[PDB]
Design a protein around this ligand. Structure first.
Ligand SMILES: [Zn+2]
Length: 307
């Protein structure tokens, strides 16, 4: 094969309107390579292509498949990462190595998702946000360690040619970015994010770099919310299907429990999702489209919510 150009996957691959979940699963590894190519990482870092193929195949293979926290989730978060690169022009904000770390983090950040819901930090703001949230910041996870175990598998070391210093910096970035997916982490840095958007992003501030990378990471994880109505509806279904994945009903109870979805999804939008994409828009005028679209989904949910 060799790598496909992004524009050959779909004329709209690079548009916020595009739904990556509609790519057949078998074409997703190739589409990862297409995106790294169009982002100029393969060329600039002179990455061996067979190696990058094996790496990508290896992380895909390492995902469990619950209804929601699965490869397609990872794939679609990665794809949003690419959309932020293309549409917000992140190279004017972050360094190449940070963008690269962000992308690989998207690919890797749910490898050790367990679904053990053991915390009240997110739940206090939104009961459904707690089910969408990745884990690792309150209970220890090994999304990161698993990513490296892959990296150190013969024939998979895509950062082989980096300097020792960039190699540590790459690993530190992944470890920190993967941790930041956990919404408990986001809540804990929220005031800092707010301060950053108030004062204005400062390319020379290393703190601003760290904060932006977390914000972007969480913006990719919840990016299902920035798609069509059908997408939040389908994703809400999946989260449910996951959490009920095993206990004697007192069919019936299942339906009472899905009658709660609208209000939970609205509370999730109002208290967690929308603030995040408000922040992006405050920092990036070109992200207005995204907040508007989440806003519009909150409207449909409200509208539906009188089942
Ligand atoms: Zn995730």
């Amino acid at each position: 094969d060799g790598i496909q150009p992004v524009a050959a996957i779909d004329s709209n691959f690079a548009s916020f309107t595009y739904t990556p979940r509609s790519l057949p699963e078998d074409d997703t590894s190739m589409a990862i390579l297409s995106m790294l190519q169009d982002m100029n990482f393969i060329n600039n870092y002179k990455i061996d292509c067979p190696t990058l193929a094996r790496f990508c195949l290896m992380v895909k293979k390492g995902y469990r498949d619950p209804p929601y926290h699965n490869w397609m989730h990872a794939f679609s978060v990665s794809h949003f990462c690419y959309l932020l690169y293309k549409n917000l022009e992140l190279t004017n904000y972050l360094e190449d190595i940070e963008i690269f770390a962000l992308f690989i983090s998207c690919m890797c950040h749910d490898l050790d998702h367990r679904g053990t819901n053991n915390s009240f930090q997110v739940a206090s703001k939104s009961v459904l946000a707690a089910l969408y949230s990745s884990e690792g910041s309150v209970m220890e996870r090994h999304h990161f360690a698993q990513a490296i175990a892959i990296l150190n598998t013969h024939g998979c070391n895509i950062f082989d040619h980096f300097s020792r210093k960039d190699y540590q910096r790459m690993l530190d970035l992944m470890r920190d970015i993967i941790l930041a997916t956990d919404l408990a982490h986001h809540l804990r840095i929220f005031k800092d994010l707010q301060k950053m958007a108030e004062v204005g992003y400062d390319r020379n501030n290393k703190q601003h770099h760290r904060l932006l990378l977390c914000l972007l990471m969480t913006s990719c994880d919840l990016s299902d919310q920035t798609k069509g109505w059908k997408t939040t509806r389908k994703i809400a279904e999946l989260i449910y299907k996951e959490f009920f994945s095993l206990e004697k009903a007192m069919m019936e109870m299942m339906d009472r429990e899905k009658a709660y979805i609208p209000e939970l999804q609205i509370s999730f939008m109002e208290h967690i999702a929308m603030p995040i994409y408000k922040l992006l828009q405050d920092l990036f005028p070109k992200a207005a489209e995204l907040y508007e679209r989440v806003a519009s989904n909150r409207e449909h949910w409200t509208k539906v919510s009188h089942k």
